[PDB]
Amino acid sequence: NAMAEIKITPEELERIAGNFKNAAGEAQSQINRLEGDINSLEGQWAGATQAKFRAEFIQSKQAMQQYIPILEGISTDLKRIADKFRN
Amino acid sequence: MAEIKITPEELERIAGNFKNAAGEAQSQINRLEGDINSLEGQWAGATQAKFRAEFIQSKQAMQQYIPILEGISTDLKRIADKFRNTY
Secondary structure, eight states: OOOOOOOOOHHHHHHHHHHHHHHHHHHHHHHHHHHHHHHTTTTSSOHHHHHHHHHHHHHHHHHHHHHHHHHHHHHHHHHHHHHHHHO | OOOOOOOHHHHHHHHHHHHHHHHHHHHHHHHHHHHHHHTTTTSOHHHHHHHHHHHHHHHHHHHHHHHHHHHHHHHHHHHHHHHHHOO
16 A cells, blocks of 8 residues: 655754754753852862762763763754655 | 852752752653654654654653752752751
């Protein structure tokens, strides 16, 4: 039987791709603000305390460094399909 | 201008930033999951499966990130409480 037709438009795929790209940017911005917060505590208490918080925060950075490229990959895969559908 | 001295109020402010960030992160992954869900039945199953698999990867990174932020919030609050009970 005939292959089952596509209902999604390239424009809609591109809108969702935009949501993923923008989410990735928001995520990076968020971690940047939080990093500023941790930075601000340095020198205002014991170095050992600051080190504990820096280490915890770096863990969150590492998780975000996994997350962001996945979102960007999804965004780009969506755009690649929209382009293929359109042309 | 002087560097801002640490107080329980400062630690609570920063703890709140981490807590709010966790909530914003949960909201983001929820919205993106909604987007992936909306593609169901709109194109081929193999295509949907691919994007679902990629998305689940991002969700898993997020499920690591969020508790790390909540941990930092808790640790900051712990210290704020210690300062109040003993800047």
